[PDB]
Amino acid sequence: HMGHIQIPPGLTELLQGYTVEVLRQQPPDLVDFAVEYFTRLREARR
Amino acid sequence: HMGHIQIPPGLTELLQGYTVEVLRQQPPDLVDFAVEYFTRLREARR
Known part of the structure; x- marks a missing residue:
């Protein structure tokens, strides 16, 4: 060490994205949104 | 308006939490972790 x-x-990079999505998408629930957003990032990078 | x-x-509050978890828990994958963390927050607040 x-x-x-x-x-x-x-x-800090991935977090900044959420700031641009939640500010634009403006979903009704952030909790559930945080799951769908990240859960999708696992099946996006190909 | x-x-x-x-x-x-x-x-900014919920995000700060992730900073304290990812820094301490130090999971192998943040993507999957971001989903389990938030997905759990939906079944925590009771």
């Missing part, structure tokens, strides 16, 4: 600060990148 | 800036609160 090198120190106590080594957050892996890629997270 | 009042203007073009009215983001609903509650989002």
